[PDB]
Design a protein around this nucleic acid. Structure first.
Lengths: 611, 601, 763
DNA sequence: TTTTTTTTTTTTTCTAATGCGAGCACTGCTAGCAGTGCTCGCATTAGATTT
């Protein structure tokens, strides 16, 4: 780090990570920092021996990175390649050939250098870039006449007669291949007879290809770009050839026509324009242009059936015992539950790539976890300085003063919510829930049940999903039997508050939720808690306890629903989700109405009892 | 400094690179004595030792070499504690100097946790002695002599945490069934939540089947039979161990919702998992452990069951002896002296084996091996016992004779294969003979023995084999990993054959039914002609044949041979040199842990 | 041997991060607070100077001293704020009596508000000057504010503290300019150094290096090397020209004999200002050249469009608001005099402006309504052309209006997407030619990844079921349900996937995917399904890319690793990753105005020509020196000077977009308001390029706009109100399919001929 | 030189501009009060390009 003239940080380096993993193997992370470095708890068992091997690699990578810096004369560069190969590589039956080739090229280069008696030192960047050019200069033409059809480029002085001669890639600019002279060469200034040029070489190879053809000559080139549907041009050679053909021949029945019309007619008759796609039915019409690939025959014939509707009614019987965690995981996302639980389909996306640079700002799940830790520490009235030092040793926070400023801002923002929570916090313990609803038994555990009520807090923005989880827990608590109210204090003064309810109403709403869960297990329950939640927030009126009907409010609710579903450029909307894409690729007004109806029916009590 | 010297230890394969890197990082640029101490501590911790007494640091050959660099130290404690890398626990440091021993900060916490859990946490639960005695008499008819099963049940019912040690085939499962029956019958109205755990899925399924079949036989009402545990799980699944991260679903803050827990095969339970389990238990849960102390120790660093049962040799407490005599209605012997009353009372040892009689050669051989007396083992071999056999294996011509004997060993299985029988009988027959080798590769090892046996079955007509096919009919396989979809566990065997619909592998489920699986559907697997002594734990074979290499390796030890001997049901054969067997039995495996000192102080 | 790189984003971001690490880290916590307030990190910091980094460096007006460090500026600002706070502390008691005695209206200045403001300012002054933040009440206590509100002919309270506060609040205090200049220098330096180290090169780097070489001592020789090689050079589209390009062309071909130079360009078409081009350098060139030549006649479009454009640009004087750019009427040619466009038997006017209804219209409402109207009108045109009614006629000759000849010109990408969605709602085929999106960002990439990942390890049921449930397979929910129960079907699927894995190992990538598509009949079902054609094209393109990437990568798992990596970070700039054309049939071509330069389109649509933007940033050109000047300060003079050039650029863009059509061009007009309040008042149409030419640069209401549109209307220009289009899908008559049969091979080709050695025979 | 396990989800911008609501000082009309002019503060909503 200091070699690149950058300020020494001491974190986010291979040494830092290695020391961290070793400390985590030695000391559990629960203990704390030892040398301002948080031990990495993951590597704790015998598997941590891998670390010992990895730390053996980097050390080597260190040593050599110091040895190769200084310039050396040629004779000193001789044992470098062999030493590096035997140190870094363990040969095998297949790789031995490549290692021998590398050694041979390196030794040949250094042998030429020593035969030239170059005394001065040579930097590694020269030999590396020379070996890179020398290694790929090789070509393999040992299968030119093996027996199968020959595929090869146009090479000068290779003229062999063949019955069928095909030519590809004749687009203007690709062929002939142009290699201009260095510019200070004296030969190109005053040329004489016998001077060779790549242009004339290709121009003569095109004639050799024509003369060598005994039976059939095939020429092809790209006319239109597949990407942009633009127009390309063929080589000047093909152009002169087709011009000569059209000027030297005439089709039967065109005797009356003049020279130009007959020439154009011949040129259009010989030039064949193939389709853009293989499944084009024109390829399969009877004729000389008829294809031989039957795989694209049913597609060209348009005989396939379209994909039927993914939604299908499936039989389901509700068991006698349903854990509360099942209902919670269902109501978190009803469609994702039907996909993951009912038919066991999981769409696991690939994990994110390692970030290129050390964290400068904190956003997303990282800052969310940091805020969660900070909040859970502040509500317990613990020292924030300990957590700050812990995160600094972990390296998650930015370097130096910026990390302190970020921590101070987050501390203020979380201290507001912590004061709000401590205002109402009381000592509470967990409890067990055994309940019966609609002939279905629910068994679960509820944590932090204080005599006052169900108190929950999360450092997130006010969202409908959290309200639904709290409402399910509240119905469970009320139906179980207790005198309390449900509260949830979310970021930016968000508040979800539910008053106590009688046992009968609690059981009724819980039975309704269980019925919805059963219907979801039968067919995918189209209930969007966020977009539909916005629709119901716009339509419903808390004062009259009745939803509006006027078409103006309907248009406003549709606009709000579309804004919630699609979303802005900065924040992705609720519609952008892997599960929703499977059900429909584009949102239709009928599906919109169905989602609105279901979401209203299911979320009406949430907005009703929210105060 | 000492870094250049430590670079040489890697070349001689004496010090692992992990240890070298750990020493270089933690010890830093302090005195070379600190670096050497750290390297030796890391090495001993990797090899399975928990602690490192400073007496051990007194003159490993590397230490003798580095004597010149470190010089002479009047007190190792002073030099070590002076550095920042070592402390007494006041401030978090990687290494901890506890008394006369050295610990890794991770190991020390788990050691202290296990110590305090076995010393102070456990309490004595009080119940009616007359009612308990009546229940146990209804469970155990014989009162003429001391029944160790009855004493074990009494101990487990009295104390909160109790461990029952005994050899294979000593009636452990039956004793646990009687224990759980008496426990359910004792508490009528109170909810009794029973949980069953095992460190391996195979042992978990075996525990499910055995406990079920045992509890169904004992007379119980529909109320009691409704509290029977549904299934037994793995320790990890019980604790909700996530695959990638080390976070536990049930941490210290979130206790397990259990009343009684039974962990089978505690011999494989290591120290870290033991501590993490202890951290998740509540204050009202009673825990019972099962395992054999002489059985091979756990893989990772640590040895809990052994270090615990080491104190069981002293015997019961004086007052506890009279208490159990009043309970069991017999005379219970009393251990002389008082060293640790709680631990000694929480331990019971089953000394009776119903499976094999004392007159059997297997039992006498196992006893002689456990006692470590080579002359006793040789005398047992010399005696006229029809169920023990020994063959000298020095030259390859004796290896060929061993293969010839393995031929007759697999004879019935091979005949049933060549006769086109049903897979059920073939699977039931395949478990009659098994080879057990210590090493994995080389001349004596699974990878080598499988190839040699296949070449020998190709030489003499037993089973046809295709080179390109790789799936010739008749080859047995075993699974490397657990699979919940197919319902097959790691360490379970299967037989690949062609019934006529196609080449499929048949497995025997714990319900007795046979399940056919496609070769493509199978996960990672390996040919199981010969098994390692480690993976052979829990299984039982009618005729077992152990193979010990000629070389001297730290793998071949006393506990390995003990497990290999106890592995067979009726017939056991050995292939090893006369001197190598004696040298292996003479050496006992030790894993240094402060438990011996902790429980005494 | 030089290498070429098209995208320099990574190197630029790395240089910015290096600058941030070098400078921001050592800073003390108190200056770090002020730095953090302005920018959160190097990511946002690069966003401000991204434009300035590209191209030639811009001259910064009033640059900070070279030796002034950040700490010096911090100390200066802290000292100023400390002086202000001390002057407030000393005058904390006299101000009350001063305000009370002097005569100022207390309705505007309430006593309670005055006391609150005094309290807040006192609390701020007593506070330590940790940050540059200043309270709002200081604006109330400024001398100018007090002078503004006072009794007519009465005593005005004046105190030196008020004058000091007025002098302070006159200019904002910030470290922005110094850090911005330091970064603009150091990041550019680092990028150039790293590119020299790697031996790479880029377009801007090519131009700058050629310019530097020519300016160098040896460049003279190099000049001859360029001069002798090309005696005569003709530059086309010269209106978009960079100062570097013109300096090069002048250095090479200014005064040397036997070397001509022909510059051809139209200043009315200078629209690439954002790309670094400048009209001021073009005018400098125009001044530096003595000879001028002009073309009189327009050969592109019908005579109706010519007269329409001439009448619309003859409304005002100096329409392009630049004295050096005079507009003159043009005359159509004799060949085009017969051009006409007939719709349902009635000849349509060459130009038709669609005026929206209402008084105040928002940006989003305008976009949605105009998109819908344009979609409806294009659907009607297609319906009338499918029956042969609507014809583009050159005299007696005619031809129907195909979906290809109709183009919709858009300014931005989001605009194009808004057009395309509405156009696809009516089941009308269309394509956006300026789309730079990557194939990997679509869902087909993820589906192909899931398929490959399942095929690689068919043993795992989870990944297999995941790949089966993809839309590409087309299975239902009952299908998956039944398949998760029956073991035989699952076994058959596992077997077919295992065979696919064998094919993948042996014959490569493309054969496995081809066999899979053949057996599962994916292509047939996709072509059958509505819209699945684009899906199949994307799948084929992904297959070709996977084959190209697996050719180089020898390991089978390495291809999956590469595909996952590319899905994680799709590269839009990559030409290979650009999405191919959906179909070869007639498609409505949505194209940006910049990409339509120099092209030709029979029928043209401008749904959102009226929409404009007000430039907040201050970057302009000096009217005297004609040099690019960036003002890091928010001085309103620079802002107005930049807004004038923005309006000129918008007028030129309007000209370019209008001159594209041949027969008919339609365009939207609506009373677009950019200010939330005073919607009933004057609209902001006059700020728009089109509005300024319709309203003669005079603000008017919706009624005034309508009256001006009616006044402008004539035989060529007709206006019609815009209403919500009817939601009816365009009906296309299906065509019967003839019998199709592929050929068979009677003679099998023989591989008997071969060349082998003893090793081959033995094997 | 030997080896056991386990499956799940978590987040989303910020600045700016205005409309209205509550409070208040002034002042003109018939000393108080209603209107008026004004102002600050809280909630709500809109918008962020082009090779």
């Amino acid at each position: 780090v200091r070699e690149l003239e950058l300020p020494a940080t001491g974190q986010h380096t291979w040494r830092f990570g290695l020391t961290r993993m070793l400390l985590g193997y030695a000391m559990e992370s629960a203990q704390g920092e030892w040398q301002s470095v948080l031990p990495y708890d993951e590597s704790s068992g015998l598997i941590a021996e891998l670390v010992g091997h990895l730390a053996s690699l980097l050390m080597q990578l260190n040593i050599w990175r110091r040895g190769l810096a200084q310039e050396r004369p040629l004779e000193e560069w001789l044992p470098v390649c062999r030493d590096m190969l035997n140190a870094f590589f363990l040969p095998d039956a297949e790789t031995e050939a490549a290692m021998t080739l590398i050694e041979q090229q390196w030794q040949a280069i250094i042998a030429e250098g020593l035969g030239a008696q170059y005394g001065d030192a040579v930097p590694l960047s020269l030999l590396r870039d020379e070996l890179a050019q020398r290694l790929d200069q090789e070509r393999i033409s040992q299968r030119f006449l093996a027996g199968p059809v020959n595929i090869c480029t146009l090479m000068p002085m290779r003229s062999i007669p063949f019955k069928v001669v095909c030519l590809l890639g004749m687009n203007d600019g690709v062929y002939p291949r142009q290699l201009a002279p260095l510019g200070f060469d004296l030969m190109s200034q005053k040329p004489k007879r016998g001077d060779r040029s790549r242009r004339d070489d290709d121009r003569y190879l095109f004639l050799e290809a024509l003369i060598s053809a005994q039976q059939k000559l095939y020429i092809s080139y790209i006319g239109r770009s597949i990407q942009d549907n633009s127009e390309r041009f063929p080589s000047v050679l093909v152009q002169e050839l087709i011009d000569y053909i059209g000027q030297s021949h005439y089709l039967p029945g065109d005797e009356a026509l003049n020279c130009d019309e007959s020439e154009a007619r011949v040129k259009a008759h010989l030039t064949c324009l193939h389709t853009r796609m293989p499944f084009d039915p024109q390829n399969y019409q009877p004729g000389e242009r008829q294809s031989y690939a039957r795989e694209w025959l049913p597609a060209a014939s348009q005989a396939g059936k379209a994909h039927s509707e993914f939604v299908q009614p499936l039989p389901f019987t509700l068991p006698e015992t349903v854990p509360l965690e099942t209902l919670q995981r269902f109501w978190a996302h009803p469609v994702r539950a039907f996909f993951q639980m009912r038919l066991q389909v999981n769409f696991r996306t690939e994990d994110s790539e390692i970030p290129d640079t050390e964290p400068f700002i904190l956003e997303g799940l990282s800052r969310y976890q940091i805020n969660q830790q900070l909040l859970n520490a502040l509500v317990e009235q613990d020292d924030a300085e300990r957590l700050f030092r812990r995160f600094r040793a972990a390296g998650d926070l930015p370097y130096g003063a910026f990390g302190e400023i970020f921590w101070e801002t987050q501390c203020q923002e979380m201290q507001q919510l912590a004061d709000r929570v401590i205002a109402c916090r009381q000592p509470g313990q967990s409890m067990e829930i055994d309940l019966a609803c609609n002939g279905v038994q629910i068994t679960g555990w509820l944590p932090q049940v204080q005599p006052d009520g169900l108190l929950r807090w999360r450092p997130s923005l006010l969202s409908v999903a959290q309200g639904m989880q709290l409402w399910l827990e509240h119905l469970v608590y009320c139906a179980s039997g207790g005198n309390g109210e449900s509260r949830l204090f979310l970021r930016k003064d968000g508040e979800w508050r539910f008053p106590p309810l009688a046992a009968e109403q609690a059981l009724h709403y819980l039975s309704q939720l269980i019925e919805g869960y059963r219907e979801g297990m039968s067919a995918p329950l189209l209930v969007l808690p966020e977009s539909g939640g916005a629709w119901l927030k716009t339509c419903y009126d808390a004062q009259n306890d009745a939803m509006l009907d006027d078409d103006s409010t309907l248009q406003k609710a549709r606009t709000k629903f579309l804004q919630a579903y699609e979303g802005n450029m900065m924040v992705r909307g609720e519609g952008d989700d892997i599960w929703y894409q499977r059900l429909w690729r584009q949102l239709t007004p009928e599906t919109m109405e169905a989602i609105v109806e279901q979401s209203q029916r299911f979320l009406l009590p949430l907005f009703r009892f929210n105060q | 400094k000492l870094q250049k010297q430590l670079l040489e230890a890697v070349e001689h394969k004496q010090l692992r690179p992990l240890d070298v890197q750990f020493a270089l990082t933690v010890a830093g640029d302090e005195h070379p004595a600190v670096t050497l101490a750290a390297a030796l501590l890391s090495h001993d911790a990797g090899e399975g030792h928990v602690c490192l007494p400073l007496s051990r640091l007194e003159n490993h050959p590397l230490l003798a070499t580095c004597v010149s660099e470190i010089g002479e130290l009047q007190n190792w404690e002073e030099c070590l504690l002076a550095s920042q890398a070592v402390s007494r626990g006041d401030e978090p440091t990687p290494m901890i100097l506890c008394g006369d021993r050295l610990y890794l900060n991770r190991m020390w916490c788990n050691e202290r946790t296990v110590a305090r859990f076995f010393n102070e946490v456990n309490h004595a639960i009080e119940v009616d002695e007359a009612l308990l005695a009546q229940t146990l008499d209804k469970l155990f008819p014989v009162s003429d002599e001391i029944n160790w099963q009855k004493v074990a049940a009494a101990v487990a019912l009295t104390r909160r945490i109790s461990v029952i040690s005994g050899g294979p085939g000593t009636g452990k499962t039956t004793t646990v069934a009687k224990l759980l029956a008496a426990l359910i019958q004792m508490a009528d109205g109170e909810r009794c939540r029973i949980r069953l755990a095992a460190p391996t899925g195979k042992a978990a399924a075996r525990l499910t089947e055995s406990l079920g079949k045992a509890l169904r036989q004992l007379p119980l009402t529909d109320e009691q039979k409704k509290r029977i545990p549904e299934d037994a799980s793995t320790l990890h699944r019980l604790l909700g161990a996530q695959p990638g991260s080390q976070r536990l679903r049930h941490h210290a803050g979130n206790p397990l919702h259990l009343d009684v827990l039974v962990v089978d095969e505690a011999s494989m339970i290591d120290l870290p998992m033991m501590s993490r389990l202890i951290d998740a238990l509540p204050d009202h849960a009673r825990v019972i452990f099962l395992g054999d102390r002489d059985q091979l120790a756990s893989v990772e660093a640590g040895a809990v069951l052994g270090d615990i049962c080491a104190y069981a040799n002293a015997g019961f407490t004086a007052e506890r002896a009279r208490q159990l005599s009043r309970l069991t209605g017999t005379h219970v012997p009393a251990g002389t002296g008082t060293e640790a009353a709680s631990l000694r009372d929480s331990l019971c040892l089953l000394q009776k084996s119903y499976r094999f009689g004392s007159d059997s050669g297997i039992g006498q051989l196992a006893a002689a091996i456990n006692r470590g007396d080579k002359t006793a083992v040789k005398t047992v071999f010399q005696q006229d016992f029809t169920d023990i056999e020994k063959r000298l294996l020095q030259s390859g011509e004796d290896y060929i004779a061993m293969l010839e004997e393995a031929l007759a060993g697999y004879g019935r299985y091979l005949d049933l294969l060549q006769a086109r029988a049903e897979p059920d009988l073939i699977i039931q027959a395949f478990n009659e003979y098994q080879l057990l080798c210590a090493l994995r590769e080389g001349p004596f090892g699974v990878a080598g023995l499988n190839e040699r046996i296949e070449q020998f079955m190709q030489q003499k007509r037993k089973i046809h084999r295709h080179p390109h096919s790789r799936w010739y009919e008749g080859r047995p396989v075993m699974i490397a990993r657990n699979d919940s979809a197919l319902g097959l566990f790691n360490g379970d065997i299967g037989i690949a054959l062609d019934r006529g619909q196609g080449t499929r592998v048949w497995f025997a489920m714990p319900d007795g039914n046979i399940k056919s699986v496609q070769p493509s559907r199978l996960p990672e697997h390996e040919t199981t002609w010969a098994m390692t002594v480690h993976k052979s734990q829990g299984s039982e074979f009618d005729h077992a044949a152990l193979i010990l290499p000629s070389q001297r390796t730290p793998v071949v030890t006393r506990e390995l041979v003990y497990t290999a001997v106890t592995r067979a049901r009726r017939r056991l054969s050995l292939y090893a040199d006369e001197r190598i067997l004696s040298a292996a039995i003479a050496t006992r495996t030790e894993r240094r842990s402060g438990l011996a000192a902790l429980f005494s102080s | 041997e030089q290498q070429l790189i098209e995208d320099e984003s990574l190197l630029r971001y790395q240089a910015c991060a290096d600058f941030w690490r070098r400078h921001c880290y050592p800073l003390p916590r108190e200056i770090a607070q002020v730095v953090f307030e302005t920018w959160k990190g190097p990511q946002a910091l690069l966003r401000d100077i991204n434009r300035y980094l590209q191209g030639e460096a811009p001259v910064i007006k009033a640059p900070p001293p070279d030796d002034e460090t950040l700490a010096s500026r911090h100390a200066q600002i802290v000292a100023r704020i400390d002086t202000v706070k001390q002057q407030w502390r000393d005058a904390v008691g006299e101000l009350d009596a001063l305000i009370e005695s002097s005569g100022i209206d207390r309705r505007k200045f309430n006593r309670s508000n005055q006391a609150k403001w005094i309290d807040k300012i006192s609390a701020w002054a007593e506070e330590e000057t940790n940050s540059y933040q200043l309270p709002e009440s200081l604006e109330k206590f400024s001398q100018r504010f007090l002078e503004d509100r006072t009794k007519a002919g009465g005593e005005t309270p004046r105190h030196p503290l008020f004058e000091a506060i007025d002098q302070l609040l006159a200019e904002p205090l910030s470290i922005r300019d110094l850090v911005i200049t330091r970064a603009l220098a150091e990041i550019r330096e680092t990028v150039a150094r790293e590119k020299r180290r790697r031996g790479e090169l880029g377009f801007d780097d090519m131009l700058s290096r050629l310019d530097s070489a020519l300016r160098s001592e040896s460049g003279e020789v190099l000049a001859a090397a360029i001069r002798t090689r090309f005696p005569v050079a003709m530059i086309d589209e010269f209106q978009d020209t960079d100062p570097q390009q013109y300096r090069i062309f002048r250095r090479i071909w200014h005064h040397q004999p036997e070397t001509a130079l022909l510059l051809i360009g139209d200043p009315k078409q200078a629209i690439y200002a954002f790309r670094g081009a400048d009209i001021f350098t073009y005018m400098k060139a125009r001044s530096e050249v003595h000879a001028h030549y002009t073309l009189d006649t327009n050969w592109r479009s019908a005579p109706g469009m010519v007269n329409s454009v001439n009448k619309l640009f003859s409304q005002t004087d100096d329409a392009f608001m630049f004295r050096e750019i005079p507009f003159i009427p043009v005359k159509s040619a004799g060949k085009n005099q017969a051009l006409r466009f007939v719709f349902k038997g009635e000849t349509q006017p060459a130009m038709k402006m669609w005026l929206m209804e209402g008084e105040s219209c928002g940006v989003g409402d305008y976009q949605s309504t105009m998109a819908q109207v344009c979609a409806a009108q294009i659907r009607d045109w297609l319906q009338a052309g499918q029956r042969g009614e609507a014809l583009l006629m050159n005299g007696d000759d005619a031809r129907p209006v195909r979906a290809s000849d109709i183009s919709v010109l858009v300014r931005s990408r989001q605009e194009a997407a808004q057009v395309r969605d509405a156009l696809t709602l009516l089941e009308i085929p269309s394509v956006y030619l300026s789309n730079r999106d990557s194939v990997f960002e679509t869902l087909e990439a993820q589906e192909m990844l899931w398929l490959l990942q399942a095929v690689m390890t068919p043993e795992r049921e989870n990944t297999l079921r995941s790949a089966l449930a993809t839309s590409m397979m087309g299975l239902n929910a009952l299908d998956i349900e039944t398949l998760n129960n029956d073991e035989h079907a699952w076994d058959v699927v596992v077997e077919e996937f295992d065979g696919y894995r064998q094919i993948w190992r042996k014959r490569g990538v493309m054969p496995m995917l081809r066999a899979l598509m053949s057996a599962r009949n994916i292509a047939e079902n996709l072509l059958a399904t509505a819209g699945g054609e684009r899906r199949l094209t994307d799948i084929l393109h992904i297959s070709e890319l996977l084959q190209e990437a697996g050719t180089q990568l020898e390991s089978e798992h390495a291809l999956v690793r590469w595909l996952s990596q590319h899905i994680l970070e799709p590269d839009s700039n990559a030409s290979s990753q650009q999405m191919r054309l959906e179909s070869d049939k007639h498609l409505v071509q949505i194209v940006t105005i910049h990409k339509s330069k120099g092209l030709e389109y029979p029928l043209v649509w401008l749904p959102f020509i009226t929409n404009f933007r007000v430039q907040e940033q201050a970057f302009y050109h000096d009217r005297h020196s004609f040099e690019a000047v960036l003002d890091l300060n928010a001085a309103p003079e620079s802002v107005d000077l930049a807004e004038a050039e923005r309006l000129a650029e918008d007028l030129r863009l309007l000209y370019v977009a209008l001159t594209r059509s041949v027969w008919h061009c339609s365009l939207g007009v609506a009373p677009l308001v950019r200010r939330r309040g005073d919607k009933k008042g004057d609209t902001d149409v006059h700020q728009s390029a089109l509005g300024r030419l319709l309203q003669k640069g005079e603000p008017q209401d919706a009624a005034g706009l309508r009256t001006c549109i009616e006044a402008l209307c004539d035989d060529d220009i007709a206006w019609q109100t815009a209403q919500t289009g009817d939601n009816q899908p365009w009906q296309v008559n299906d065509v019967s399919t003839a019998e199709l049969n592929a050929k068979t091979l009677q003679r099998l080709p023989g591989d008997n001929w071969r060349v082998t050695s003893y090793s081959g025979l033995q094997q």
